[PDB]
Design a protein around this ligand. Structure first.
Ligand SMILES: Nc1nc2c(ncn2[C@@H]2O[C@H](COP(=O)(O)OP(=O)(O)OP(=O)(O)O)[C@@H](O)[C@H]2O)c(=O)[nH]1
Ligand SMILES: Nc1nc2c(ncn2[C@@H]2O[C@H](COP(=O)(O)OP(=O)(O)O)[C@@H](O)[C@H]2O)c(=O)[nH]1
Ligand SMILES: COc1ccc(N(C)c2nc(Cl)nc3cc(F)ccc23)cc1
Ligand SMILES: [Ca+2]
Ligand SMILES: [Cl-]
Ligand SMILES: [Mg+2]
Ligand SMILES: [Mg+2]
Lengths: 346, 424, 54, 437
């Protein structure tokens, strides 16, 4: 019998993993501070990696990759993409971005050098700003940095994707969430199911102070949007409907137009940081579930916007995905008495 | 280094004689005090329990005490009786009548100075005396009353040495007189104040072990003392045998006792033997020794939590297997080990096994379920004391009901202290 | 990556390799502390012995 | 030439010292009676091995070494063992009763009683020195003597030799071989009192040595002897620049200068490779590149931690055997490309390297095999502070209930020394964190 410990009660995915583990009858849960665990579903902040792996007679395994924050917080990820040769500043799937610190290293003096060449060349010059609520999409810089300095934390501002792919009927934006599980061996597994978090308001390319047809957050759509759920239940179109739409309207497959680029981008990013975070020869082992967020443009080209390191699922898919985490992340290390993941290797 | 051993009373002396027999065998010493064993390990630390005398003789560093000569004479005529130095026999004539007050206050005071004279002689012939172990019963008269009187005297003359006791707890299933709760309670009050470490040897437990599992239909004191001499040899092996852990009484006190009052230990032994052929496997040994059915103190360990555990393995076996098995118990039952004392279970191995065993395991647990024992005594105390029953035997010797009330309170406080950490 | 201060001899050599530039109390107080703890100890012993006298 | 005096305190220090001086003697060709034929300068000299051995008129080479323990059973084994003739009796100092796993007993109650004797005997060593440069002090964190007596002796050495360097080799506690439940307390106490009296300290985590001995030596349940012979190897690797011809780490001061920029953070991480069983029938010999790469596997560190999630402040490579610089810089280049090695702002990204062409001497009959080349990397990474975290957390669990505090107080220590020590360590932990993240 294996023992685990839960340190993030506010995690939907792992609350369901805890329930599934007990159900086997081969996993008992201990108190959050008992160090004689096999498995830690750690806290999201200041997880005590240094205390893992020092219990004799216990193989110990944790649901985060120490160092994975470098991919999963926005300025960190920009820094990683620019400075890492494997991705390079010539990266063709990540938008132009820059790291700006408030008034109170910084890149706004390098920003302006590109922004003014965008305004002179008479190119679309919309730029978005955000850090890791408080979003500004603007057409001229003096709105952007002015807003950044009213807040007090590091910000990234990046080339807004002016020509996105719009779903018809409705002429609306969306983002694609892929769920990726990296196990203790560093197998990269992409879950067969993704989701399209859409917008319920036709895309208004006029004034960029309305965030209802430009930002695709499940929260800002239930409350402040007109017809939340008119086209799909909860603003969420899954992969079958979207493949079917791609075939009918655009004469292609989701696999061919989009997925191939996504599988490339995932594998890029993870293989890039693998030597810094891998636990292959460590005294404790790591797996981690990641949420890659993608935006497709009107030319069927995929772009990576955020990597989230503590992601929630879609109520329909919690069961299958959390059962998969158990199968390939947890039972692989602690075995009990047709896979839903695509393995990414090349 | 040196240990000075005291046995007091009928019960004290009987289990002490058996102890000296057993370890005198284990160290190759015969009833005449001449060494006749083969190996080396038998003599490396022989001086912890024995003095060397003329002609390469070994004399146990032991003082025999009683208020009546019956049991002392029995020991002299007993198997190893002539191994002790006769001057170390200190006895009265009048007896103590199962009366704590007589042993502590009237009859025993008359005899206590000469006992301390012999103690003094034994200690000044020590190179570095570590402390004393006293064997006695808590329900009798001499053992409980005069032994606890001895103990506090000893504490006064040697306040920087360790006081350790094997204390046999009275039980109605094995009972001589009705006043045994009284005596017990008055003793426990003493012990919680003047011992560093006390092995609670419950006669209830010993009876149940002889009955339910050894299948002995009518257990005698002998059947009980065989378990006792087994357990004593176990819990002192790391004292008298050279090991990697090179242990003494003060280290055991330091590491087993988080708080000074909670020094009452639950001992256990495996395999449980009667006075066999199948070798025990290390996993067997390891989960018999943790079994409630192997503990000499009658308490359910699952009814509280372990503060500390020491576990000794005797015999030739796989250190690796013992390590693994000990860890499986802790990791599979970590509910019952307090988390605020990290790595509270320590293990020792001694190559030499006891007589008649390929491999054995001995258990020393400091658990809050020991409270059950004291609660038992306290209930038995109160049922009489709420009617002042049998008190006259005590007030006849000069005692006051007040002293009883104070002993009772202190033991109740002791139980509460254990309950405080059972929920921490 | 440049190799500097190479010093070498019949038992071995040593050198440096750069890959990138840069981006108490007195004897008095001690014996006072030791004797302070001796005093607390002697006081706890006196406390004990007086109690044992009672 | 400047001499070094080794002081071994407690069981752990004394048995490790036994190990190291056995190794030392094999290495300099010093026989068990103290005779070194290659030494033509009879009765004296200012040779490099003389920093650790003094010479008698009779050609006997005698360790500049004191062994001190509060009970006699371990040093008695020195007095009757193979190398009894090596040591002059008044260098072996024993008491009568140990400190019973209690820092307060060793620092206060018993230490006071035996500190002035020890200091006198060390002075008799120092008085045989033309230009003493300082001390190498070996001791456990866990034991009563090892923690308590050591920090008292460190304080007093800072007084009686205030311009001399003091280096520690300290055994950090691990449960697979630990002898006491109160070892986190002693570890925090002795670290807080010693911190300002120690210029550089090499921590060795028993958990690490144990695992190294299980994985690489196929020893199923390692003994102190196993552990010590491997630790002596590492210690010999560290001190060889003091006992041999060379230009790197020639004096104790050079260890501070090369490994310890901030004075408080004076805990280098030792990593050693290769460690190869003697019972390996078919072993093939690892390249310079292979062993310099193993220097960055956490399974080869003296302390299990992850330098990838820290920063370096210093790095030194000590090779022994068939090694030339160019193979060194080859392996460095490729490793820099394939590994996470981040230095702090204000530090050069670089390696101070030392080579000594004689391969590691191994104890005949031991568990370790000769290899043609070996290396020890001393790196001042902030990741070693992980260890302090583990320790402090254990400390905290116990002290929250004042469990076992009573034993210390009863020796004359004040409860406030507990918080004070813990209080400093939380300082230390923060220094590491700000220097490193
Ligand atoms: N590596 C190694 N560790 C040892 C050795 N001996 C003891 N230890 C460790 O040291 C710690 C115990 O400290 P000791 O040095 O034995 O204690 P002491 O210094 O003798 O102090 P007291 O015996 O309490 O008076 C534990 O963590 C042991 O595992 C040894 O020979 N080698
Ligand atoms: N285990 C054990 N208990 C005993 C023995 N003899 C007496 N007792 C118990 O001790 C108590 C009687 O005290 P006793 O030792 O005879 O009186 P004392 O001589 O004045 O100490 C009762 O609880 C008895 O069951 C014995 O040999 N073995
Ligand atoms: C729980 O922590 C500890 C408990 C006890 C101890 N020591 C000092 C011991 N002493 C003696 Cl005499 N016998 C022992 C027998 C054992 F099986 C284990 C330890 C023993 C050390 C640490
Ligand atoms: Ca010479
Ligand atoms: Cl000086
Ligand atoms: Mg009787
Ligand atoms: Mg010792």
């Amino acid at each position: 019998m294996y023992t685990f410990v839960v340190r993030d009660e506010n995690s939907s995915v792992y609350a369901e993993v805890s329930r599934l583990l007990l159900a086997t009858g081969q996993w008992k849960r201990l108190r959050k501070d008992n160090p004689r665990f096999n498995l830690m579903l750690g806290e999201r902040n200041r997880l005590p990696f240094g205390r893992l792996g020092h219990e004799p007679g216990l193989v110990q395994l944790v649901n985060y990759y120490r160092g994975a924050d470098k991919l999963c917080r926005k300025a960190s990820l920009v820094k990683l993409i620019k400075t890492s040769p494997e991705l390079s500043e010539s990266c063709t799937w990540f938008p132009e971005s820059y790291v700006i610190y408030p008034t109170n290293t910084d890149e706004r003096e390098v920003f302006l050098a590109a922004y003014n060449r965008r305004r002179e060349g008479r190119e679309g010059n919309v730029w978005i700003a955000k850090s890791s609520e408080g979003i500004l999409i603007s057409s001229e810089a003096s709105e952007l940095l002015d807003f950044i300095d009213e807040q007090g934390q590091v910000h990234v501002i990046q080339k807004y994707l002016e020509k996105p792919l719009l779903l018809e009927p409705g002429h609306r934006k969306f983002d694609i969430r892929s769920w990726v599980l990296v196990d203790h061996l560093y197998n990269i597994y992409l879950y067969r199911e993704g989701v399209l978090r859409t917008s319920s308001e036709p895309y208004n390319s006029a004034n960029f102070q309305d965030k209802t047809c430009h930002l695709t957050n499940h929260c800002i759509q239930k409350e402040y949007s007109k017809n939340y759920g008119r086209y799909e239940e909860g603003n969420e179109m899954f992969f079958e409907e979207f493949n079917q739409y791609l075939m009918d309207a655009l004469n292609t497959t989701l696999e061919n137009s989009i997925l191939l680029q996504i599988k490339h981008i995932i594998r890029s990013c993870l293989m890039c940081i693998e030597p810094a975070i891998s636990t292959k020869h460590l005294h404790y082992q790591s797996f981690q579930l990641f949420g890659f967020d993608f935006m497709v443009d009107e030319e069927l080209k995929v772009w990576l916007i955020e990597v989230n390191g503590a992601p929630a699922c879609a109520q329909k898919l919690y069961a299958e995905l959390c059962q998969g985490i158990v199968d390939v992340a947890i039972s692989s290390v602690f075995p009990l008495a047709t896979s839903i993941f695509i393995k990414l290797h090349h | 280094r040196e240990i000075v051993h005291i046995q007091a009373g009928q019960c004290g002396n009987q289990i002490g004689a058996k102890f000296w027999e057993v370890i005198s065998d284990e160290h190759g010493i015969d009833p005449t005090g001449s060494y006749h064993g083969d190996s080396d390990l038998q003599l490396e630390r022989i001086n912890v329990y024995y003095n060397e005398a003329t002609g390469n003789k070994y004399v146990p560093r032991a003082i025999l005490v009683d208020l009546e000569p019956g049991t002392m004479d029995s020991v002299r005529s007993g198997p190893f009786g002539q191994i002790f130095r006769p001057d170390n026999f200190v006895f009265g004539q009048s007896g103590a009548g199962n009366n704590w007050a007589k042993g502590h206050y009237t009859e025993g005071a008359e005899l206590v100075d000469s006992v301390l004279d012999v103690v003094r002689k034994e200690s000044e012939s020590c190179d570095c005396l570590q402390g004393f172990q006293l064997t006695h019963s808590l329900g009798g008269g001499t053992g409980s009353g005069m032994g606890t009187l001895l103990i506090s005297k000893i504490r006064e003359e040697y306040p920087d040495r360790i006081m350790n006791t094997f204390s046999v707890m009275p039980s109605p299933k094995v009972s001589d007189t009705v006043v045994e709760p009284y005596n017990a309670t008055l003793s426990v009050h003493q012990l919680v104040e003047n011992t560093d470490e006390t092995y609670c040897i419950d006669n209830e437990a010993l009876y149940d072990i002889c009955f339910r599992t050894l299948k002995l239909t009518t257990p005698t004191y002998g059947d009980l003392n065989h378990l006792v001499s087994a357990t004593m040899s176990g819990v002192t092996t790391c004292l008298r045998f050279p090991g990697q852990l090179n242990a003494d009484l003060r280290k055991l006190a330091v590491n087993m006792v988080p708080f000074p009052r909670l020094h009452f230990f639950m001992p256990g032994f495996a395999p449980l033997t009667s006075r066999q052929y199948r070798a025990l496997t290390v996993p067997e040994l390891t989960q018999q020794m943790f079994d409630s059915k192997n503990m000499m103190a009658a308490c359910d360990p699952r009814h509280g939590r372990y503060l500390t555990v020491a576990a000794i393995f005797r015999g030739r076996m796989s250190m690796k297997e013992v390590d693994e098995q000990m860890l499986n118990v802790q990791n599979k039952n970590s509910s019952y080990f307090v988390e605020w004392i990290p790595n509270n279970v320590k293990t020792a191995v001694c190559d030499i096994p006891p007589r008649g065993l390929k491999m054995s395991a001995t258990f020393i647990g400091n658990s809050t379920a020991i409270q059950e024992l004291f609660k038992r005594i306290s209930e038995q105390f109160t049922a009489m004391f709420r009617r002042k029953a049998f008190l006259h035997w005590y007030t006849g010797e000069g005692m006051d009901e007040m002293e009883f009330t104070e002993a009772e309170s202190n033991m109740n406080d002791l139980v509460s202290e254990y309950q405080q950490y059972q929920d921490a | 990556m440049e190799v500097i201060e190479l010093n070498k001899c019949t038992s071995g050599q040593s050198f440096e390799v750069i890959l990138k530039p840069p981006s108490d109390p007195s004897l008095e107080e001690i014996q006072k502390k030791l004797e302070a703890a001796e005093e607390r100890r002697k006081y706890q012993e006196a406390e004990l012995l007086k109690h044992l006298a009672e | 030439m400047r001499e070094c005096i080794s002081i071994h305190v407690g069981q752990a220090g004394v048995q490790i010292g036994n190990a190291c001086w056995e190794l030392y003697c094999l290495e300099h060709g010093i026989q068990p009676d103290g005779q070194m034929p290659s030494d033509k300068t009879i009765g004296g000299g200012d040779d490099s091995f003389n920093t650790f051995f003094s010479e008698t008129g009779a050609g006997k080479h005698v360790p500049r070494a004191v062994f001190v323990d509060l009970e006699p059973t371990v040093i008695d084994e020195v007095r009757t063992g193979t190398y009894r003739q090596l040591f002059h009796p008044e260098q072996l100092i024993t008491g009568k009763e140990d400190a019973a796993n209690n820092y307060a007993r060793g620092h206060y109650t018993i230490g006071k009683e035996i500190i002035d004797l020890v200091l006198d005997r060390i002075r008799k060593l120092a008085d045989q020195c033309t230009g003493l440069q300082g001390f190498l002090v070996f001791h456990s964190f866990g034991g009563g003597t090892g923690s308590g007596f050591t920090s008292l002796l460190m304080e007093r050495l800072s007084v009686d030799y205030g311009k001399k360097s003091k280096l520690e080799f300290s055994i950090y506690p691990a449960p697979q071989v630990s002898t006491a439940v109160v070892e986190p307390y002693n570890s925090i106490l002795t670290t807080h009192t010693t911190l300002e009296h120690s210029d550089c300290a090499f921590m060795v985590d028993n958990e690490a040595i144990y695992d190294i001995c299980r994985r690489n030596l196929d020893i199923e349940r390692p003994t102190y002897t196993n552990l010590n012979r491997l630790i002596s190897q590492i210690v010999s690797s560290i001190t060889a620049s003091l006992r041999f011809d060379g230009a790197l780490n020639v004096d104790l001061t050079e260890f501070q200068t090369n490994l310890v920029p901030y004075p408080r953070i004076h805990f280098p991480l030792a990593t050693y490779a290769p460690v190869i069983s003697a019972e390996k029938a078919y072993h093939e010999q690892l390249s310079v590149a292979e062993i310099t790469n193993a220097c960055f596997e956490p399974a080869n560190q003296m302390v299990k931690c992850d330098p990838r999630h820290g920063k370096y402040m210093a790095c030194c490579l000590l090779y022994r055997g068939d090694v030339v610089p160019k193979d060194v810089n080859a392996a460095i280049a490729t490793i820099k490309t394939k590994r996470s090695i981040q230095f702090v702002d204000w530090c050069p990204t670089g390696f101070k390297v030392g080579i000594n062409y004689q391969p590691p001497t191994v104890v005949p009959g031991g568990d370790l095999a000769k290899v043609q080349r070996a290396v020890c990397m001393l790196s001042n990474t902030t990741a070693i502070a992980e260890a302090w975290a583990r320790l402090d957390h254990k400390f905290d669990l116990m002290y929250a209930k004042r469990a076992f505090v009573h034993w210390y107080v009863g020796e004359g220590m004040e409860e406030g020394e507990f918080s004070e020590a813990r209080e400093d360590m939380a300082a230390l932990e923060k220094d590491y964190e700000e220097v490193g993240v």
